[PDB]
Amino acid sequence: SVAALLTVVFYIAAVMATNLYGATFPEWFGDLSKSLYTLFQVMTLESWSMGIVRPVMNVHPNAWVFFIPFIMLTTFTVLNLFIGIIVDAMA
Amino acid sequence: SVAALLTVVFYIAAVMATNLYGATFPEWFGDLSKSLYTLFQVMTLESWSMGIVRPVMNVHPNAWVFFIPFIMLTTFTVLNLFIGIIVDA
Amino acid sequence: SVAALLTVVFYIAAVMATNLYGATFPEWFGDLSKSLYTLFQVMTLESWSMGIVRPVMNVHPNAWVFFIPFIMLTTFTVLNLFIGII
Amino acid sequence: MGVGSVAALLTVVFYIAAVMATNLYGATFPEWFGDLSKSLYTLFQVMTLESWSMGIVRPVMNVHPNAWVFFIPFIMLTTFTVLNLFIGIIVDA
């Protein structure tokens, strides 16, 4: 149920990002699949700032309003999900 | 409860960093909002050392005394706010 | 216990990656030992995308099909081993 | 107390490895390991896993190959203990 919620989340943000940054950043968001890849990378927190967001903000200042919240939501969910797997296996 | 304390901590360090490193590193610390961004990136641990702390230490060495503790504080509280919310449900 | 199967998982993927990407990326995959190093770094998530997967995808596109699953598998097992001590 | 004693064990482990690395890699990599304080900073960065491989270990291995035998274990140990201190709060709730 949570895994579905998250996938929905990725899907929504992937579509949004493609239409928001795909023009100026084809390598990372030009496609809905490219956006999926990039958003997953951001989720693992790998080079999200130095490698993706900071460069993005050089063209679209305040794009941080799309990514920091995305980071919060995605991190939070994953945290919970993990806890459940860990907690329930113990119980 | 942690959420507000954390916001306080971020605000303290952001104000501190702005006054401390904003002159030499305006791209990351020149503004109170720039310092907000940088300190969150450092909290996510994304290029905190190689990308931010090591460059800053070429100018103001031993600035790790601000950063490493900031890392402990924010890391520990986010560990705590996670466990706190999680154990409950 | 969890460590017993994860070791197997790493060995499978390492053998797979060596045969798949060792030709074009010998610095990271040319050896079975090299692929062991690379896959562990990818497991710790350090520069997996920008540093490893994205450059590999310029040669073999859709190689994320190996990596992203490898990432889920190895990340998942870590929590099952983290709790597998507790 | 352990938390505290485990935190004291960690401090010991960091001191061990920091002394080790200074003597092992400080010659060839003085910016990262030339000092006991430099090795302190580097080992903590490796602990938070930020550019540990691409940034530190991979470059060190071009000089002393198989120095991953120092690093990968150090990673295991410090990451495990920090998780031991994490669960030492998980059930301590």
From TrEMBL, chain B:
It is found in: Membrane. Keywords: Membrane, Transmembrane, Transmembrane helix. One of its GO terms (cellular component) is voltage-gated sodium channel complex. It comes from the Bacteria. The chain crosses the membrane at residues 63-87. Signal peptide: none annotated. GO terms for molecular function: voltage-gated sodium channel activity. The keyword Phosphoprotein does not apply. The keyword Membrane applies. This is Ion transport protein. The chain holds residues 133 to 221 of 274 of the full protein.
From TrEMBL, chain D:
It comes from the Bacteria. The keyword Membrane applies. The chain crosses the membrane at residues 2-17, 67-91. GO terms for molecular function: voltage-gated sodium channel activity. One of its GO terms (cellular component) is voltage-gated sodium channel complex. Keywords: Membrane, Transmembrane, Transmembrane helix. It is found in: Membrane. Its main location: membrane. This is Ion transport protein. It comes from Magnetococcus marinus (strain ATCC BAA-1437 / JCM 17883 / MC-1). The chain holds residues 130 to 221 of 274 of the full protein.
